[PDB]
Amino acid sequence: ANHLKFIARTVMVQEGNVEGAYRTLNRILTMDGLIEDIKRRRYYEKPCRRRQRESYETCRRIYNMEMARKINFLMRKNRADPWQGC
Amino acid sequence: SSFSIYPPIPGQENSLRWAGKKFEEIPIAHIKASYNNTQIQVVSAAHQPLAHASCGTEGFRNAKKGTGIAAQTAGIAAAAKATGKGVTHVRVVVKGLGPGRLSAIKGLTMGGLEVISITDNTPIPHNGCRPRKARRL
Amino acid sequence: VDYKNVQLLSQFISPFTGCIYGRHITGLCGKKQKEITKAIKRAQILGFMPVTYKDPAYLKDPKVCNIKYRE
Amino acid sequence: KNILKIRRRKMNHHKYRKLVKRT
Amino acid sequence: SRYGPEYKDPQIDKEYYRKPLAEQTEEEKYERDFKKTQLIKAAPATKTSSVFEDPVISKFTNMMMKGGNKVLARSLMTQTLEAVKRKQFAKYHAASAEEQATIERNPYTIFHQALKNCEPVIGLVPILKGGHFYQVPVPLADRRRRFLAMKWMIAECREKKHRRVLMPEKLSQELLEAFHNQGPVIKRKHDMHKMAEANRALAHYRWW
Amino acid sequence: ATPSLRGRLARLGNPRRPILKPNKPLILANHVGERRREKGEATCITEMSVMMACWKQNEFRDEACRKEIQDFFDCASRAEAARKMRSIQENLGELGSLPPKKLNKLLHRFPNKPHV
Amino acid sequence: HRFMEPYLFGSRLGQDIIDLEQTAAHLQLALNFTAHVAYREGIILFVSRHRQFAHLIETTARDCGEYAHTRYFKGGLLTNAPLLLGPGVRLPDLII
RNA sequence: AGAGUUAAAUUAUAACUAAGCUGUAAAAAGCCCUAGUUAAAAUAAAAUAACCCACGAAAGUGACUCUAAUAAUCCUGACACACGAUAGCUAGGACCCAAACUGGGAUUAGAUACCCCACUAUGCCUAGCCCUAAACCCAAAUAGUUACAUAACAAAACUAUUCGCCAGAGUACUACUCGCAACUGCCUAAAACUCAAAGGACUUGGCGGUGCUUCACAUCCACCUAGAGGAGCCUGUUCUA
Ligand SMILES: [Mg+2]
Ligand SMILES: [Mg+2]
Ligand SMILES: [Mg+2]
Ligand SMILES: [Mg+2]
Ligand SMILES: [Mg+2]
Ligand SMILES: [Mg+2]
Ligand SMILES: [Mg+2]
Ligand SMILES: [Mg+2]
Ligand SMILES: [Mg+2]
Ligand SMILES: [Mg+2]
Ligand SMILES: [Mg+2]
Ligand SMILES: [Mg+2]
Ligand SMILES: [Mg+2]
Ligand SMILES: [Mg+2]
Ligand SMILES: [Mg+2]
Ligand SMILES: [Mg+2]
Ligand SMILES: [Mg+2]
Ligand SMILES: [Mg+2]
Ligand SMILES: [Mg+2]
Ligand SMILES: [Mg+2]
Ligand SMILES: [Mg+2]
Ligand SMILES: [Mg+2]
Ligand SMILES: [Mg+2]
Ligand SMILES: [Mg+2]
Ligand SMILES: [Mg+2]
Ligand SMILES: [Mg+2]
Ligand SMILES: [Mg+2]
Ligand SMILES: [Mg+2]
Ligand SMILES: [Mg+2]
Ligand SMILES: [Mg+2]
Numbered sequence: 002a003n004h005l006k007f008i009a010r011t012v013m014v015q016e017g018n019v020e021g022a023y024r025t026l027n028r029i030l031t032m033d034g035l036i037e038d039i040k041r042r043r044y045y046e047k048p049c050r051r052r053q054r055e056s057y058e059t060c061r062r063i064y065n066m067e068m069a070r071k072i073n074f075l076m077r078k079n080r081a082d083p084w085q086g087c
Numbered sequence: 088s089s090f091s092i093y094p095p096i097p098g099q100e101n102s103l104r105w106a107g108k109k110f111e112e113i114p115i116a117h118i119k120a121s122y123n124n125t126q127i128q129v130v131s132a133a134h135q136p137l138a139h140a141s142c143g144t145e146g147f148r149n150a151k152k153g154t155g156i157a158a159q160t161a162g163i164a165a166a167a168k169a170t171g172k173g174v175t176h177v178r179v180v181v182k183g184l185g186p187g188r189l190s191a192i193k194g195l196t197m198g199g200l201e202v203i204s205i206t207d208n209t210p211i212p213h214n215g216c217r218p219r220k221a222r223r224l
Numbered sequence: 225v226d227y228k229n230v231q232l233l234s235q236f237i238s239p240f241t242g243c244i245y246g247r248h249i250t251g252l253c254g255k256k257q258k259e260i261t262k263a264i265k266r267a268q269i270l271g272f273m274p275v276t277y278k279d280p281a282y283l284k285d286p287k288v289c290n291i292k293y294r295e
Numbered sequence: 296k297n298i299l300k301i302r303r304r305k306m307n308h309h310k311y312r313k314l315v316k317r318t
Numbered sequence: 319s320r321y322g323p324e325y326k327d328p329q330i331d332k333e334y335y336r337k338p339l340a341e342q343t344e345e346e347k348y349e350r351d352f353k354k355t356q357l358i359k360a361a362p363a364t365k366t367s368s369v370f371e372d373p374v375i376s377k378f379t380n381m382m383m384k385g386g387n388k389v390l391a392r393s394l395m396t397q398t399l400e401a402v403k404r405k406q407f408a409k410y411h412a413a414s415a416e417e418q419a420t421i422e423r424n425p426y427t428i429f430h431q432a433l434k435n436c437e438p439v440i441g442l443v444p445i446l447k448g449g450h451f452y453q454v455p456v457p458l459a460d461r462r463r464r465f466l467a468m469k470w471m472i473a474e475c476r477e478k479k480h481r482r483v484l485m486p487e488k489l490s491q492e493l494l495e496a497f498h499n500q501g502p503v504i505k506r507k508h509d510m511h512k513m514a515e516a517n518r519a520l521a522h523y524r525w526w
Numbered sequence: 527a528t529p530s531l532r533g534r535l536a537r538l539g540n541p542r543r544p545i546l547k548p549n550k551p552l553i554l555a556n557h558v559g560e561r562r563r564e565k566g567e568a569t570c571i572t573e574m575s576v577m578m579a580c581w582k583q584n585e586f587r588d589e590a591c592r593k594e595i596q597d598f599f600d601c602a603s604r605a606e607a608a609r610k611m612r613s614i615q616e617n618l619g620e621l622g623s624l625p626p627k628k629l630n631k632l633l634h635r636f637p638n639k640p641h642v
Numbered sequence: 643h644r645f646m647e648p649y650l651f652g653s654r655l656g657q658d659i660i661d662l663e664q665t666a667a668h669l670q671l672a673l674n675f676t677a678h679v680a681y682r683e684g685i686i687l688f689v690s691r692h693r694q695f696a697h698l699i700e701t702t703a704r705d706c707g708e709y710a711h712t713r714y715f716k717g718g719l720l721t722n723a724p725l726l727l728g729p730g731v732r733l734p735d736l737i738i
Numbered sequence: 739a740g741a742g743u744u745a746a747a748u749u750a751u752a753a754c755u756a757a758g759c760u761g762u763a764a765a766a767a768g769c770c771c772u773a774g775u776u777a778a779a780a781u782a783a784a785a786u787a788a789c790c791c792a793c794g795a796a797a798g799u800g801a802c803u804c805u806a807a808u809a810a811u812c813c814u815g816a817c818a819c820a821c822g823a824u825a826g827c828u829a830g831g832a833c834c835c836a837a838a839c840u841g842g843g844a845u846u847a848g849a850u851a852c853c854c855c856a857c858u859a860u861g862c863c864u865a866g867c868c869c870u871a872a873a874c875c876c877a878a879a880u881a882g883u884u885a886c887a888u889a890a891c892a893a894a895a896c897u898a899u900u901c902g903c904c905a906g907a908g909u910a911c912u913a914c915u916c917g918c919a920a921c922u923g924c925c926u927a928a929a930a931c932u933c934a935a936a937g938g939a940c941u942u943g944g945c946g947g948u949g950c951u952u953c954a955c956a957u958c959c960a961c962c963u964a965g966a967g968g969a970g971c972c973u974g975u976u977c978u979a
Contacts (some may be wrong), residue, residue: 004745007178009277010240011094011206019202023189025092026207029293033241037207038182038785044221045836053547055788059529060548062789065527068554072623075632079624084693087712089611092294093239096280117775128774131947137756143758143773150764151519182774183843197576213746213801214784216835217861224852236787243786248527254790258745268745268803275745300937301872308911315922439588439595440574443960448763457570457602464960499589508586515578524568526609529789536875537893544875545791559949 105176107116116177118191125158125187127165137172140165158187162194179205225259227266230273234287236260239278251287325357332367378468397486399425402493433494435466436503440514446521455521456515469501554638557630569605573598684735
C-alpha cells in the first residue's frame with residue numbers, strides 16, 4: 002500500500018502464453034506458504050488449535066523426512082538379486 | 088534470448104514496449120476473485136476506469152456466479168467493452184483466492200485482449216483484524 | 225550482520241514476497257539465522273529496507289539460497 | 296472411559312447451578 | 319456365453335480376405351489370427367456377406383421389433399424405405415430441372431442423413447449433491463448418441479401418429495422431415511441442447 | 527536435514543515443556559502408505575462454454591457452427607482416451623520412485639528395530 | 643550388540659575389531675568339541691541362513707558326511723520333530 | 739515494568755465508474771447511504787523468520803527502539819507472604835474487527851441448535867477487585883544409579899532425604915461451619931441413606947451417517963428392455979362375518 006506497485010508477486014508472461022505464467026506465479030505463492038496462509042485466514046483459528054496444528058505438522062514432517070531418508074539409503078539394494086534360487 | 092520474469096522498474100532505462108507504450112503506461116485489469124463472485128475492472132494507467140464486468144453484471148444468479156464458467160464469461164465481456172475503448176494490452180492484478188481466478192484471466196485472453204504481466208495482490212494481513220469464527224461448532 | 229547493509233540482508237529474502245527464508249533454505253548456524261532475522265526486521269522498520277518485495281537493485285547479486293522457483 | 300466420571304460431575308454441577316438460579 | 323472367452327468374433331467382410339497382398343501389418347495380423355489356432359464364433363443369422371445390408375438399417379429394424387417378430391419389423395422397415403423412395407419419386411417428377419438436380423432419391427442416404435441431423439451433441443445426467451438432484455451437462459459417447467437418435471425416431475412415430483395411420487407412412491414422413499431439420503424429433507434434440515445451456519454452470523459438478 | 531527431536535517430547539528426564547505431542551509414537555513403520563488416487567475434475571468445460579456461446583448467438587441451429595461442435599467432440603475423445611490410458615501408466619510408473627509394493631518389500635528386507 | 647563387548651579388542655575409527663587372541667582361544671574349544679562329537683558318531687547340522695554362502699555350506703556339509711539346513715527354517719522343526727520329519731527321528735547332536 | 743514508534747491489512751471519508759453487492763450443499767433475509775479502482779487518520783492485532791526451542795517461579799512471553807531488570811556461595815519447608823490463563827465485577831476512556839445475548843432468514847415433526855445477516859455485553863487502555871481452569875507435561879522438590887528387573891497401557895526401571903496427599907462407590911466441585919473488597923461467589927468439607935460393587939488396562943467379536951484403496955456385472959449410480967402399482971376378471975392374504 003505504501004510500497005511501490007507491481008514489483009511484488011508479479012510474473013511477466015513469455016511469448017504470450019499465460020497459463021504458464023500463472024502456473025509460475027502459483028508455484029511462487031505455494032512455495033512461500035502465502036496460499037496456505039490466505040486459506041487459513043478465511044476463518045479464525047484459536048491459539049490452542051493452532052499450537053496443535055504446528056505440533057502435528059512438525060511430527061508429520063519428521064516422520065516423512067526420516068522415512069524418505071531411509072528410502073534413499075536403502076535404494077541401492079533394489080537391484081536384481083545375485084543369489085537367486087540359492 | 089534473455090527473458091526476465093521480473094517486471095521493469097520505473098527508474099530504469101529499460102526498453103520494452105507494447106504498441107509503443109512503456110510498461111507503466113499499459114492499462115490494468117483488476118480482478119477480484121471471491122468465493123461467491125468474481126468482478127473485473129479495466130482501468131487506465133492513470134486510474135480512469137475504462138470497463139467493468141462482474142458475474143452478476145453478466146446475468147448469473149446466486150450460486151451459479153461462483154463457478155469458473157461464470158468468471159470466464161465476465162472476462163470475455165470485460166475484454167469486449169475494453170477493446171471498444173481501444174485497449175490492446177493489459178496487466179492483470181489478481182486480488183483474492185477464488186473459483187474464478189484463472190478462469191477470468193484466460194477469459195480476458197479469449198475475449199480478444201492481450202495479457203502481458205500477471206500480478207497477485209491478495210490482502211495478507213501481517214495480523215490486523217481478527218477474521219470471523221469457524222463453521223460447524 | 226549489520227542492519228545498515230540491506231544488501232547482505234536482502235540476500236535471504238524471497239524476491240517475490242519478501243518473506244524471510246528458513247534455515248533449511250539459507251543454511252545458517254542458528255545464531256546467524258537469528259541475527260539475520262532480527263537485522264532484517266530492524267532495517268524494515270527503521271526505513272532502510274522494503275518489506276513486501278526484495279529491492280530490485282539487489283536482484284542480480286549472488287544467490288546463496290537453495291530455493292528454486294522456476295522449473 | 297474416564298469421561299463417565301467427568302460426565303457425572305458435569306451433570307451434578309449443571310443441575311445445581313440451575314437450582315441456585317431458581318432458589 | 320456358450321462361447322468361452324477364447325472365441326473371437328468373425329470378420330464377415332469379403333473384400334478383406336480377397337485382396338491381402340498389398341498390406342504387411344494386416345498380413346501379419348490375420349496370420350496371427352488363424353495360425354494362433356484361434357476359435358471363431360459362428361457367424362450370426364442376422365449378418366450376411368450381402369452387398370445390400372446396412373448395419374444401421376438392421377439396428378433400427380431391431381429397435382423397432384416388438385416380441386419376437388423380425389418378419390414384421392423387417393416388413394415395416396422395407397415398406398418404409400420403399401415409401402420414402404416413392405415419396406421422393408413423387409417430389410421429383412412434379413419438379414423442374416434445377417430441383418431435379420437437387421432432390422435426393424436414395425432412401426438409404428436419406429435415412430443416414432436424417433439420423434446424423436437428429437443425434438444430440440451434449441446430454442444430461444442427474445447428479446446428487448447435498449441431498450438435491452441437479453441435472454448436469456455430460457459429453458456423450460458416439461454409440462450413445464446414435465442410439466438416442468434411433469430411439470427418439472421410433473418413440474415419436476409410435477406415439478404421436480393417429481391410430482388410422484400406418485407405421486411406414488408416419489416413419490417415412492418423419493425421416494424426410496428430419497432430413498430437412500424441421501421434424502419434431504429435431505425439436506426434441508433442441509430441447510435437450512437448451513436444457514444443457516440453461517444448466518451450464520452446473521457443468522462443474524461433473525467429476526469425470 | 528530432519529527437524530530436531532532433542533528436548534521435544536515430554537519425558538521424565540526432559541527439563542523443559544513439550545514441543546511436540548505426537549498422536550502416535552514416532553517409530554519408522556516397516557511399510558509405506560498407499561498412493562492417494564487423484565480427485566477428478568470436469569473436463570472439456572472450456573470447449574463446452576465456447577460451443578454454448580456459439581449456440582446462444584446463432585439460435586441453436588447446428589449447421590451454423592460446425593467448428594465448436596467438432597472441437598468439443600475432439601476434446602471429449604481426448605478425455606476418454608486420457609481416462610483409459612492414464613490409469614494404467616499412473617498405476618505403474620512412479621517416475622524416479624518405486625511402486626509401493628516394491629518399497630514395502632525393500633523395507634521388510636531391512637526393517638526397523640524398536641525392540642532389544 | 644551389548645553382549646559382545648568383552649570380545650572386542652577395541653574400535654578402530656568406527657569399526658569394531660574383534661580380539662583374535664580370544665577368537666583362537668574359543669575356536670580351539672569349538673573344534674575340539676565338534677571333533678569329539680564326530681568321533682562319537684553323532685549328527686552334526688550346519689545351519690546358516692545367508693544367501694551367499696548357502697551353496698558353499700551345503701557343499702561343505704555333504705563332504706564331511708554331515709547335514710546342512712541352509713534354507714527357510716520351518717516353524718516346529720526342532721521342537722515338534724516327529725510331525726515335520728517323521729514318526730520317530732533322531733535329532734542333531736550338535737548344531738553349527 | 740515503563741516510555742516512545744509502525745510495516746501489512748482494515749475503516750471514517752471524499753473522487754471517478756458500474757447496477758447491483760453479500761451470502762450458502764442450495765436459498766432466503768440483509769444492503770443498494772451498495773460495489774470495484776484511487777486516495778486516507780484513529781483503533782485493534784502483531785505474515786514470513788519458527789524445520790528455532792529461548793526467557794520467566796508459575797500463569798505466561800515470539801513487530802521495532804531505548805531505560806530499569808531476571809533472589810540465594812543455590813537442601814527440604816507452611817494454613818504465613820507475594821503472584822496467578824480465560825471468563826466476570828466496579829469506575830473512567832476507546833471501538834477497526836470479532837462476538838455470548840437478542841432480532842431477523844433458512845433448516846426441521848419441532849430447532850428456543852448446527853448454517854446466513856445485523857447488532858450488544860465483552861475482547862482494548864487506566865485504576866481497583868475477583869483467585870478459578872483438562873492452572874495436566876494428569877509424572878512433587880533436591881541429590882543420584884542403569885545395578886535387580888517386564889501385571890497391562892503409557893513417557894523404561896530404581897535408590898536416598900523430605901514435604902503434600904490417598905482408607906469401596908454413589909450421596910458430594912453438596913448440607914452445615916470459619917475466613918475472604920467475593921452477597922447466584924471462592925475456600926474448607928460431612929452425614930443419613932442407597933448399592934455389592936464402582937473403577938483401571940486389555941482381548942476377540944460386532945458395529946461405525948470414520949478414512950484410504952479395490953470392486954458390484956442384472957447391479958448400487960450411470961444406462962437398456964419388458965412388466966407391476968390404475969381396469970375387468972382369476973386366485974391368495976388381511977380384516978370384518
Ligand atoms: Mg464445545
Ligand atoms: Mg448425579
Ligand atoms: Mg524454565
Ligand atoms: Mg492419544
Ligand atoms: Mg498502514
Ligand atoms: Mg472512529
Ligand atoms: Mg432478496
Ligand atoms: Mg509481525
Ligand atoms: Mg537466579
Ligand atoms: Mg526453599
Ligand atoms: Mg486473574
Ligand atoms: Mg477484563
Ligand atoms: Mg466500562
Ligand atoms: Mg462493542
Ligand atoms: Mg459478525
Ligand atoms: Mg431464530
Ligand atoms: Mg501500563
Ligand atoms: Mg497451561
Ligand atoms: Mg493434579
Ligand atoms: Mg514441594
Ligand atoms: Mg489400600
Ligand atoms: Mg461416603
Ligand atoms: Mg469449581
Ligand atoms: Mg460450595
Ligand atoms: Mg459442619
Ligand atoms: Mg434388477
Ligand atoms: Mg400384461
Ligand atoms: Mg400396470
Ligand atoms: Mg391391477
Ligand atoms: Mg387362513
